[PDB]
Paper text:
Pol I subunit A43 does not contain a connector element in Sp and therefore should be unable to form dimers, as inferred from connector deletions in Sc16. Taken together, we concluded that reversible, connector-independent dimerization of Sp Pol I is possible. A three-dimensional reconstruction of Sp Pol I dimers at 4.5 Å resolution was obtained in C2 symmetry. Unambiguous placement of two Sp Pol I monomers and rigid body fitting of subdomains yielded a model of the Sp Pol I dimer. Whereas establishment of Pol I dimers depends on stalk-insertion into the cleft of a second monomer in Sc, the Sp dimers form by interaction of the stalk with the protrusion domain of subunit A135 in the other monomer. A second interface forms between the ‘dock domain’ in subunit A190 of one monomer (including the Sp specific insertion of residues 580–587 and the Pol I specific helix α12a) with the wall subdomain of subunit A135, subunit [name] and the common subunit Rpb12 of the second monomer. These two interfaces allow a tight association via the establishment of contacts between both Pol I upstream-faces independent of the connector element but utilizing organism-specific regions. Low-resolution density on the lobe of subunit A135 in both molecules in the dimers may indicate the presence of A49/A34.5. Further cleft expansion in Sc Pol I dimers likely results from mutual stalk-cleft insertion and is not observed in Sp Pol I dimers. Despite this divergence, functional importance is apparently conserved: Both molecules in a dimer are likely unable to initiate transcription since binding of the initiation factor Rrn3 to the stalk-dock region is blocked by the neighboring monomer.
Transcription of the ribosomal RNA (rRNA) precursor by RNA polymerase (Pol) I is a prerequisite for the biosynthesis of ribosomes in all known eukaryotes. Here, we use single particle cryo-EM to solve the structure of Pol I from [name] (Sp) in a monomeric (apo) and an actively elongating form at high resolution, showing that Pol I cleft contraction upon transcription activation is common to both organisms. The architecture of Sc and Sp Pol I is similar, despite poor overall sequence identity. Nevertheless, we conclude that the principles underlying Pol I regulation ‘activation by contraction’ and ‘hibernation by dimerization’ are conserved among organisms.
Residue numbers in the entry:
A (entry chain P): 12 to 34, 44 to 59
B (entry chain M): 1 to 97
C (entry chain M): 1642 to 1681
D (entry chain R): 61 to 142
E (entry chain J): 1 to 68
F (entry chain M): 484 to 724
G (entry chain C): 117 to 232
H (entry chain N): 1029 to 1046, 1054 to 1120, 1128 to 1174
Write the structure that this text describes.
Amino acid sequence: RKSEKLDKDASSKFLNRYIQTIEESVLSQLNRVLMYLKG
Amino acid sequence: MNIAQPVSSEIKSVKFGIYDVDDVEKISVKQIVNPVLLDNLNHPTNGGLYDLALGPYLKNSVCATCHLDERYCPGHFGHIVLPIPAYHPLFFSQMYN
Amino acid sequence: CHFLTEAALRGDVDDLSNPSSRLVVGRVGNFGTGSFDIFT
Amino acid sequence: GKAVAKEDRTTTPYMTKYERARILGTRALQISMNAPVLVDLEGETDPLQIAMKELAQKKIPLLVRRYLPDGSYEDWSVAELI
Amino acid sequence: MIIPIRCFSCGKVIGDKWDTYLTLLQEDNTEGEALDKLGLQRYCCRRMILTHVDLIEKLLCYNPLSKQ
Amino acid sequence: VNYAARSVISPDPNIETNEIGVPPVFATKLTYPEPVTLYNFNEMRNAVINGPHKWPGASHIQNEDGTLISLMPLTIEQRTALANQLLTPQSNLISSPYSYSRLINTNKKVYRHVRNGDMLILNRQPTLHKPSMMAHKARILPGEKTIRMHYANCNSYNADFDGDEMNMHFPQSTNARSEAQFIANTDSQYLVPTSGDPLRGLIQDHVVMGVWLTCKDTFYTRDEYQQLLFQALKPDETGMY
Amino acid sequence: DMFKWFQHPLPGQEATHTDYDTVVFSLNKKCEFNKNAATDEKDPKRLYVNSEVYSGDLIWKPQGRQEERFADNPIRVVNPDIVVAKLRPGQEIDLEAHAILGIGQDHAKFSPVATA
Amino acid sequence: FQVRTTGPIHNLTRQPVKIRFGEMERDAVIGHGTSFLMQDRLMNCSDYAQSWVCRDCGSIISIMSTISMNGVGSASEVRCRSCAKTSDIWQDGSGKKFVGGTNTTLIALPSVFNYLTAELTAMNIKMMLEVK
Amino acid sequence: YGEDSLDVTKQKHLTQFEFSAKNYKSLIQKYKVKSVLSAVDSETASSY
Amino acid sequence: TMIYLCADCGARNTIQAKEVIRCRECGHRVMYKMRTKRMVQFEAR
Amino acid sequence: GYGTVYKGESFDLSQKRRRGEPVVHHFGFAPGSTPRREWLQKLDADGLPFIGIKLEDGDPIVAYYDESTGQNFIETYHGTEPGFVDEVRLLGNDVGDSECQQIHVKLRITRSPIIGDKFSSRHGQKGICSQKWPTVDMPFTESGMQP
Amino acid sequence: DLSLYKQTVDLYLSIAPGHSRDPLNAIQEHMDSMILSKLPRINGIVLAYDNIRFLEKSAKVMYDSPFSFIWVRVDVLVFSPKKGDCLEGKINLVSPSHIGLLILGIFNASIPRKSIPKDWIFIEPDTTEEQGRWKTNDGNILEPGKDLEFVVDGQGTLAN
Ligand SMILES: [Zn+2]
Ligand SMILES: [Zn+2]
Ligand SMILES: [Zn+2]
Ligand SMILES: [Zn+2]
């Protein structure tokens, strides 16, 4: 149990990576948070 | 005894030790002050010796403390106070010596 | 009562050695098949 | 504490009279709880004896740990024990 | 609901003959007498696949377990 | 404790030195849990078919979540339906309770009666030394209402077979029953711990007629020899041969 | 003719089956939504898979010696083509059928001849 | 002749009410060196129970299931009173707000031991059993 | 322990030199020499 | 708990006794009970 | 002609909350004891019956218990013919923030053509199902289909 | 702000016996359960997890449960809105008793009128009674201002 520092771009790239690794509704709201963060 | 249980702990060591007055305050949930046990209503008097915050009574009562029936409430202790303090009768000889 | 109060004063810690103290805490004893552990 | 290195192992290379017992116990448990069997069945139904057929060929996972009273312990694969 | 197999009057089973007769009016340009190609010599087991209402294809569009 | 009967004993020479013959009553009133796999599926299903009032029927069901469906009130129709669906994913969620999904991998636990391969503990009060409490194989006998075992166990339990009853225990899990089956099985208690002297073995009648028969003055035609050899063997009740 | 009559079970009725009396079939279908659909064509035969529970989906389940006694003549529904019910994404039907010998004047389904 | 698969449990200690196994039999099973059998017959078949403990304070009674956090939501995550003092905080059956006492685990142990802890707390003497 | 060899159970025939030497062929396979001799040391202690 | 069906959204809700009743994903306030597997037997008449 | 009746009843707990107390009853069983001889066979666990289970007259339909008393009450099937249950409905009592105080059971009753029921062509020519003659004792055309 | 958090935690996972061939299987099996479900150990909601590696201990099996246990290291993506500082959301429902906002298109916010400064006023339309504009004190209208920035108390606050 421990924490580390992070910023938003690595969070976005990691979320992308996470959509990539694991392959429903979970992934749907993930798509939602994705199109929310970007642009 | 169920094979599907995931119990992950391990009791590693038991250690004894007396508890002070302060810790009894933190754990206890209630205090009994009324020597009355039951009312004409046949019901546990609040703050009384059958306090439903001490635990769920039978006849399908829910604990006032844990808000669950008697199947799942592990019972929650209470405390009764006295500004006397008299010595502890087990350590009596050791205390006096 | 006696051993009880005596252990209460000092507060000596057994880990748990005899399979009897093992037994009062429900865990298996340290003897027999219960001495060793099996893995994956 | 420490884990004893595989190179230096003083515990008896023999399958103790107790070790076989506990091993077969858990192997029956796994198999009974829908675990993969690494030996062909011969029509066998008791989930437990099946583990006997498994041990008889020593085709079995679930290495064992032998704890020295000091605090060290050995890790013996079932295929490595006698 | 569904086309009632084993017609009342006749003893002929007809439940098979529904989509096979539907795609006769549908694309064969022949009128209802395409059932004559089906082999319903009588009128009894004949008047079923003729004037049967297949309401269930409209009832089935009512799954509350449509997940949508 | 639970799952432990208590009955009067009478010996029997037919059964085994290992197995204990049990009346069907206990086989009904003593049941233990069992996960169901694909290959043991037919056995368990059959036991569930037989029902809770006919050996080797099954007691009742426990769901993977942990609940416990009984089997006395049902009819054999409902039994049949429950049995056919005794092995299937019935949990109506990947983890019905919360986000702790190990329940997808559990099985339906069938509580089944005891049968001819079961290991059930025997004991006697007072139990002085470890051969005074051992593990026996189960064989279910029909008819009698009294637990039967072989003489050769008389000596180890030292019981006089006058009425002195016994405690009859049954391990729940698989590891405990395997352990009783291998370490403390009656067959593994032949040399007492005090000295190496074996205590289990034959008694007055066996030693007597053994003396008589063994004497060189004896003779047998083919009929007697075959009948006697088979009579002792009876491999089928044991198998393996 | 290869069968023996069913003794209708009077009270005390449960255990009145055998393998020389009756036969059992089964079916179980859950219409899954088919994902290979291009667009909206409410056929729905191609929009969904197993939307129609036919008669060809009542599989005979042998009962012991039956499997052998009819190994020369495997028993089936004589019309494997009838549509029995219709299904859609999500729902399911699961059951098994018990068939015996019966005489027409008891039930019409027992009358074998379509028209005499 | 008395069979008992199960039945009534005691008022106080949840024991099958008044077959005897132990205190000489224990010598027997441990003579065979058959631990799992012992823990099976005397702990499992007799009184098996799950109870929480405060991992830090090491007490077994200062535990309590949290109360009325939100709707049915997630589980009522038990907490400790002795180790205590928006999501973290919670309330009491009487309404006393609190916080902390999070480090809580679930352990198997015979309920008769729980009774012992009860009547020993009745003496102000209590053990602080830790866990790993 | 207690002259380690073992409690009475498997030390009853240690004294029975003759009966061991009598057959020894059931026994040599019962002990499964081909496996034992693999992983164990023999000559050091036999020499000492 | 009990498992129900949000009428419109069509989403399993897993609600428990003595609880506010509504769809968790869309907010609907009407829900049916799913049909468990329960042995029922019928005659063919 | 296969008659199928839908008799739909609702149950509501507010009516038995006359005054003086808040909402007290809740559908299901008071935690603890529960009659099995009928109830658990019909009522699923929620005090609500199984979906599609056959009922009879003297048969519980739904179960609510009082909070204070902690005792289970029951509702029987007034009707006097075997009826099943096609669906049960948990009515959100209000805008929200309300326990399920209304339930709706839709019972399906089967009415095949029975002796004593009425038929009529579209000319007012009403008739009555008298005997359901055996299909073989019926006359037939030269084609043979029976009337 | 930087309300996003990734934290490599170590857990005591319960490996099923049937997945004894590969632990990663049963690990991800329930790891897909933690996603989007609050990990209370850290008090946040799982958003992502990778680096599924176990401290190799050839997992010790329970004494009587065939499913074993092992420590595994994985990296979570909890989002911690612990009343830190200014965050922002898209308004979805607006009515003069509280305002409903969506943060990150998922999570909800009910800022009541009391945590809102009294100076802002609501307009109750003709087509809709409650679906209307909580026009600010400035008079700026808030629906097309779908984004509202605010501070969190745990639950939101608009009072300054
Ligand atoms: Zn409580
Ligand atoms: Zn016709
Ligand atoms: Zn604490
Ligand atoms: Zn909804």
